[PDB]
C-alpha cells in the first residue's frame, strides 16, 4: 500500500486569499524586506499563533496586500504598521516566491518541488 507523500507535489505559485481572525493579539509571523521595497516575505510562522492556526501561509510567501492595501512595494517598517493596525480580521493576499525569499537566508536554496532548503 505505497504511501502518497505531499512533499514531492509542487507548492502552488498562484496568489491566494488568507483570512486570519486574531482579535487583539499578534498574527504570529515574521516578515523580511528591505527599506528598498523589493517585496515583503514571510520568514517565520509561530507554532500555535493565529497565522499557524489559519494553516494557509508558509515561509517564503510574499505578502501582496493586507485588507486591500498593496504591499508589493512596501518598506518593512510600513508593512509592519499596516499589519499590526489591520484590525481583528486580517485579509492577506499571498503568493509563494521561494527564489526571492531564499536570497535572505544563509545557505538556502529552492529544490525541485519548490521547497526552501537550508544546508
Amino acid at each position: 500500500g505505497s504511501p502518497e507523500f505531499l512533499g514531492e507535489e509542487d507548492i502552488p505559485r498562484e496568489p491566494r486569499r488568507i483570512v486570519i481572525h486574531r482579535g487583539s493579539t499578534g498574527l504570529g509571523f515574521n516578515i523580511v524586506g528591505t527599506e528598498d521595497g523589493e517585496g515583503i516575505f514571510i520568514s517565520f510562522i509561530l507554532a500555535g499563533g493565529p497565522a499557524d492556526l489559519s494553516g494557509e501561509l508558509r515561509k517564503g510567501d510574499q505578502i501582496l496586500s493586507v485588507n486591500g492595501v498593496d504591499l508589493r512595494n512596501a518598506s518593512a517598517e510600513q508593512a509592519a504598521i499596516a499589519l499590526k493596525n489591520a484590525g481583528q480580521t486580517v485579509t492577506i493576499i499571498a503568493q509563494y516566491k521561494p527564489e526571492e525569499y531564499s536570497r535572505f537566508e544563509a545557505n538556502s536554496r529552492v529544490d525541485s518541488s519548490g521547497r526552501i532548503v537550508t544546508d
Binding site: 509571523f29 515574521n30 516578515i31 509592519a80
Partner: peptide
C-alpha cells in the same frame, strides 16, 4: 544589508 525583519 538593506534588510529588516519584524514580528507582527
Amino acid at each position: 544589508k538593506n534588510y529588516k525583519q519584524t514580528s507582527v
